[PDB]
Design a protein around this ligand. Structure first.
Ligand code: ACP
Ligand code: ACP
Ligand code: K
Ligand code: K
Ligand code: MG
Ligand code: MG
Ligand code: MG
Lengths: 207, 132, 211
C-alpha cells in the first residue's frame, strides 16, 4: 500500500543523486571554459588599458587603437557569457512578477516546473508583456491578498491564467486590458476575463 | 645597464602587449619573443638574456618544463600565470624560478619584480602561494 | 547484434536525460554570471569608448577613465578567480586534512602514508572520491567504536583506489545498502566500484577510473 510510495521516493532520491554529478560534471566543464575565455580576455583588458594610459601623450593614435581592442574584447566576453546558453524570457518575467507581488504583500502562487519550454521567441515575448501587465493590474487595482499564475501547454496553444482574490474595479483605448487583447488577437491569440470572484484573465497564444 | 628580456607567451595579443609594456622602461629591452616552452629554451641557451618572462600553459613544452631545462643556465626566470593551479607554485620553486607573478598585476609591479630579481631577490605573488 | 542497437537506444536515452540536466545547470550559471560580471564588463566597454573619445579633447579625463577601466578589470578578474575555484569542487588533498581533524577530534588514531599519489585525476572523479572518503570516515566516527582508522590512497594501474579500514565492529545488517548505497551508486556512475569487508572491523575499497 505505502511501500509503493516508500520505494517511489527511494527511486526519486537515487535519481536526484545522479543529477548532482551530471550538474557538477557540466559545472567542472564551464569553469575550464571560463578560465580559458574570460581569464585571458580580462588579463588582456588590464594590460591593454595600462598600455593605452601609458601612451595618451607619447602616441595617442596607438592608445586609441588599444582602447578599441579593449572595448571589443569586453563586448565579446559579455557576449561569450551569454553564449553558455542558446532561450526563455518568460522565465525572466516570472522573476520580475515574484519580486513585484512580494513587494506588494500579495501571496504568489505558481509552479516553476509547468513553464512551457517551447513557444516562438516572438510569442514568448508577447506573453511576457501580457503577464507583466496582468500582474501590474493586480498590484495597482485588486487589493488582493493572493495571486495565482498558471502556464499550460494545451493542444496547439500556450494558455496563461492570472487570477487574484481582490475585487474588480472596472466598469479602453491606450490601456492594458484592450492593449493585451489587441496584441494577442493580432498574434491569432485571445484574452478572456472573469470578474466574479476577484479577477481572472485567460490569455492564449498559438504554439 | 640595460636588462635584456625574452618573453614566452602563446597568446599573441598578450605577448605583444607585454613586450610593449616592458619596452616603455628606460633600463629594459625585449631581445626576443616566443610562443612555446621550446622557443624559450632555444633562445635562453643560445642568446643568454638576463631575464626570461615565462607563461606556464603553452603548447609543446610548458613554461614550467622550460624553466626546469634552464635551471642551471644563468638566466633569471619570472613566471606569469592568470590562475593559481595546485602544485604550480612548488614546481616553480623546485625549478628555481626567481619570480612567480599574475599576468594582470599592474605593469609597474612587473618591471619592479624584474629589477628585484636582477638584484638577487625572489618575488612570489602572495595569491599564488598555496596558503592565501 | 540487436543488443548493439538497444545499447545505442539506451545511450541515446541516457544522453537525452543528461542533456536536460546540463541545460538546467547552464541556465543557472549563465544568469548568476551575467548578474555578478555583466555590469562590470559593460562598464569596461563604456569607459574604454569614452576614454578613446576623450584622448584628444581631454586627455586628463581619458587617463582618469582608463584608471577606472584598469581597476574594474582587475576586480572582475578576482571575481572570476573565486567563481572558477568554487565551481571546481573539493580537492582530495583538502579532504585528507578534514578527515585527520575529524578522526583526532573523535580520539581515533589515523594511519596514513603517502604512496603512489594520483598523478592526474579528473576534477570530477577527484570530487567524487572526496565525497566518498568523507562518508567512509563519518561512518567510522558514528558507528565503529574503532580506536584506529587506516586510509590508503593509491594510483594502481588505470584506477585510483582508496581503502578505509577501521578496527571497530560492523553494526549493519546482512544487507546494509544512505551513505553505503549512495557511495556505491556515485562510484558506479563514474564506472568505479565499492566493495566492503566486515570481518575484522570494516574495510571499504573504493576505486574510480584514472589514466
Ligand atoms: N486585477 C484587477 N483587479 C481589479 N480591477 C482591475 C484589475 N485589472 C483591471 N482592473 C480594472 O480595469 C480597469 C482597466 O484596466 P487597464 O489595465 O486597461 O487600465 P489601467 O487603469 O491599469 C491603466 P494602464 O493599463 O494603461 O497602466 C482598471 O482601471 C481597473 O478599474
Ligand atoms: N565503519 C562502520 N563501522 C560500523 N558500522 C558501520 C560502519 N559503516 C557503516 N556501518 C553500518 O552500516 C549502516 C549503514 O551505513 P550508511 O552509511 O549507509 O548509513 P548511516 O547509518 O551512516 C546514515 P547516512 O549515511 O545517511 O548518514 C550503519 O547504520 C551502520 O549500522
Ligand atoms: K627600452
Ligand atoms: K638558473
Ligand atoms: Mg493596466
Ligand atoms: Mg598560456
Ligand atoms: Mg553513513
Amino acid at each position: 500500500r505505502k511501500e509503493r510510495e516508500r520505494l517511489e521516493e527511494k527511486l526519486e532520491d537515487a535519481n536526484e543523486r545522479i543529477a548532482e554529478l551530471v550538474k557538477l560534471e557540466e559545472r567542472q566543464r564551464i569553469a575550464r571554459d571560463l578560465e580559458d575565455t574570460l581569464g585571458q580576455k580580462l588579463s588582456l583588458i588590464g594590460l591593454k588599458s595600462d598600455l593605452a594610459r601609458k601612451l595618451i601623450y607619447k602616441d595617442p593614435e596607438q592608445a586609441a587603437r588599444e582602447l578599441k581592442s579593449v572595448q571589443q574584447t569586453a563586448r565579446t566576453s559579455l557576449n561569450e557569457v551569454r553564449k553558455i546558453v542558446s532561450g526563455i524570457r518568460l522565465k525572466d518575467e516570472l522573476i520580475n512578477i515574484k519580486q513585484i507581488l512580494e513587494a506588494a504583500d500579495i501571496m504568489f502562487i505558481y509552479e516553476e516546473e509547468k513553464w512551457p519550454e517551447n513557444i516562438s521567441l516572438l510569442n514568448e515575448n508577447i506573453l511576457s508583456m501580457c503577464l507583466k501587465e496582468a500582474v501590474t493590474n493586480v498590484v495597482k487595482h485588486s487589493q488582493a491578498k493572493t495571486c495565482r499564475v498558471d502556464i499550460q501547454q494545451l493542444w496547439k496553444e500556450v494558455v496563461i491564467t492570472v487570477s487574484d482574490d481582490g475585487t474588480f474595479k472596472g466598469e479602453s483605448k491606450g490601456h492594458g486590458l484592450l492593449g493585451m487583447r489587441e496584441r494577442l488577437e493580432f498574434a491569432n491569440g485571445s484574452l478572456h476575463i472573469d470578474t466574479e470572484n476577484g479577477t481572472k484573465l485567460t490569455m492564449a497564444i498559438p504554439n | 645597464s640595460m636588462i635584456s628580456i625574452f618573453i614566452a607567451e602563446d597568446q599573441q595579443m598578450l605577448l605583444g602587449a607585454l613586450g610593449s609594456l616592458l619596452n616603455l622602461e628606460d633600463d629594459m629591452e625585449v631581445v626576443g619573443k616566443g610562443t612555446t616552452g621550446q622557443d624559450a629554451v632555444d633562445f635562453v641557451k643560445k642568446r643568454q638574456p638576463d631575464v626570461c618572462i615565462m607563461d606556464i600553459e603553452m603548447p609543446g613544452k610548458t613554461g614550467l618544463e622550460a624553466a626546469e631545462e634552464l635551471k642551471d643556465t644563468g638566466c633569471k626566470i619570472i613566471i606569469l600565470t592568470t590562475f593559481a593551479r595546485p602544485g604550480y607554485f612548488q614546481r616553480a620553486i623546485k625549478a628555481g624560478v626567481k619570480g612567480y607573478l599574475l599576468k594582470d598585476s599592474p605593469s609597474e609591479e612587473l618591471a619592479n619584480a624584474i629589477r628585484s630579481v636582477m638584484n638577487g631577490k625572489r618575488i612570489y605573488a602572495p595569491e599564488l602561494m598555496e596558503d592565501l
